[PDB]
Amino acid sequence: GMTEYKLVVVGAGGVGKSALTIQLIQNHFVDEYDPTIEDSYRKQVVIDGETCLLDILDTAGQEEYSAMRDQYMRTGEGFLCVFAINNTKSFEDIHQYREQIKRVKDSDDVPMVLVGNKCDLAARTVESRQAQDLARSYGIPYIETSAKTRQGVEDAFYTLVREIRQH
């Protein structure tokens, strides 16, 4: 009964979305990387004692292909909506990503997580309070990660899996 979950990362480009999945799948004690090789987006993990397989889709770099977003999102059971804490615009776009996900999945209750991502040392413009409140108004978990120290990265994905399992 090895369950596979199809997770899809979405969010503004140009602000380190990419690091979230890279740090996860990497192991992460290593620091070299090849996205080219197959099963560099597959990852077996043990969440709450039950083992499962994570299949992450991260199309970072393809954001200008805006008409492909439905094609991509349609494939997923769970979603990470990522913004950068030093980019207010990426935070304001979170609404349009959520509405767009609800539409392609044709549901008002799609398992999703809001992730706030620290990509560098430029000042925070989105406090965690605001992000918490948005995430509460949607009835979804909020998780902050660091694009450097791998903090909160496991928490992000595992929470989304918990959100799928308890849907």
Binding site: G14, E38, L57, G61
Partner: protein, 469 residues
């Protein structure tokens, strides 16, 4: 062996150690090194490595400025000759002339290969990466001065050649084919009558051909300078990646135009003819190896407004469901089948650029700029080789031209397509979806009826070409 210059009048003769160069576990492959060592290997006396030259010139700007590169190559170029040997001294002492054997061997086996390789880097630099010089006229000046003051008649041929080449690139291509391109095909719209041109009135064979030509040119035009350093994703992306972006925006346009042709065709029968014709166009895309085209169509069918039109899907002929489903399967499992088919066909082809973009991006964000070893900071060169492997695969498909006649009017028709008009994206995207809800409402609401909008026959001429004499 042979004696290298003194390591104090010439920085490029320091012995290799794990403090300045690290190799990968017939020529060796560099994992990491200093810039001195990278440039030395770039122009090594023992062997040529044209792949290293392309990799380096494509990617060096993340670790070394252009002005600095040119200075280091110029430095590498001025190799000190050795002093007269003991035998040379004894001959001169006796009025005779030296054999100068060691000196002549040093010239022929160290200096000459190293200098030519330097000149080869300059040649590839000027001929394939001329933008460093377009964006910095001082750098161009320095380069012309260096090349122009290279004395020595073993170099003369390439010095003169490289001088002309630089002069050409400053103030600045037709094709030959095995066969003749097929006759342009016409359906309802006849030549000249561009006011009638539209999805169903042009020949589906000729829609595919001309979109494929157009999309091939857009693909062929993207240079690695638009990709290296992830610049298409940054705030200056409009400045740095204008061809990559033009290409993507065309793909988006076409995908929305397909969505729009469909959902604005409110009569069910008419809309089925529309979808079926788009699937016929997709079919000629597959024949033509235009994978960008294939996925423009597949993205359109999978979009929110179109995917939900169950009544329409239901009437698509079986053989065309099959074609659409096969194309859609190219995209499953992180493009597993697409990647295998792309690596399988006989070019010309038009790849989907999005996979390449994501790979370059992750390679760059997933690998460290430097490796720290023995308290030294080595350039992580394997990281740059990975990016260059990708830009090389891209360039490999940019070489082959399609054997197809341009039709000026049809080409201008597709260039000018503007489905969104003056409307922003969410406004237009919401419009398409409402059209989808109007023409095939959610259950339990009943299916309305709608009048024909097309006055011309809906029957497809088919996707098999014809041949008069």
């Amino acid at each position: 062996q042979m004696r290298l210059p003194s390591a104090d009048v010439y920085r490029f003769a320091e012995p290799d150690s794990e403090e300045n160069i690290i190799f990968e576990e017939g020529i060796p492959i560099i994992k990491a090194g200093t810039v001195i060592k990278l440039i030395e290997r770039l122009t090594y006396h023992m062997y040529a490595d044209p792949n290293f030259v392309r990799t380096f010139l494509t990617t060096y700007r993340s670790f070394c400025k252009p002005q600095e590169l040119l200075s280091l190559i110029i430095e590498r170029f001025e190799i000190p000759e050795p002093e007269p040997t003991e035998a040379d001294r004894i001959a001169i002492e006796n009025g005779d002339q030296p054999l100068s054997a060691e000196l002549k061997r040093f010239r022929k086996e160290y200096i000459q290969p190293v200098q030519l390789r330097v000149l080869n880097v300059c040649r590839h630099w000027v001929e394939h990466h001329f933008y460093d010089f377009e964006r910095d006229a001082y750098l161009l000046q320095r380069m012309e001065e260096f090349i122009g003051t290279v004395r020595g008649k073993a170099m003369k041929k390439w010095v003169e050649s490289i001088t002309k080449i630089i002069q050409r690139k400053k103030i600045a291509h037709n094709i030959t084919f095995q066969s003749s391109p097929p006759t342009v095909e016409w359906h309802i719209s006849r030549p000249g009558h561009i006011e009638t041109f539209d999805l169903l009135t042009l020949h589906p064979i000729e829609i595919a051909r001309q979109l494929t030509l157009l999309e091939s040119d857009l693909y062929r035009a993207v240079q690695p300078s638009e990709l290296v350093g992830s610049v298409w994703t940054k705030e200056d992306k409009e400045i740095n990646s204008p061809n990559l972006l033009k290409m993507i925006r065309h793909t988006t346009n076409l995908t929305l135009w397909f969505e729009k042709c469909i959902v604005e065709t409110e009569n069910l029968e008419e809309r089925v003819a529309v979808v079926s014709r788009i699937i016929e166009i997709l079919q000629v895309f597959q024949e033509l190896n235009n994978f960008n085209g294939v996925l423009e169509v597949v993205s359109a069918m999978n979009s929110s407004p179109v995917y939900r039109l169950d009544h329409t899907f239901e009437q698509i002929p079986s053989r065309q469901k099959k074609i659409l489903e096969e194309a859609h399967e190219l995209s499953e499992d992180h493009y597993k089948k697409y990647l295998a088919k792309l690596r399988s066909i006989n070019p010309p082809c038009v790849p989907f650029f999005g996979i390449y973009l994501t790979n370059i991006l992750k390679t760059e964000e997933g690998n460290p700029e430097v490796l720290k070893r023995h308290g030294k900071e080595l350039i992580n060169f394997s990281k740059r080789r990975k990016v260059a492997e990708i830009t090389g695969e891209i360039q490999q498909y940019q070489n082959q031209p399609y054997c197809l006649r341009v039709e000026s009017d049809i080409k201008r028709f597709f260039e000018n397509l503007n489905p969104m008009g003056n409307s922003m994206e969410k406004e237009f995207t919401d419009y398409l979806f409402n059209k989808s809800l109007e023409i095939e409402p959610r259950n339990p609401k009943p299916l309305p009826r709608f009048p024909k909008k097309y006055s011309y026959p809906l029957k497809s001429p088919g996707v098999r070409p014809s041949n008069p004499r």
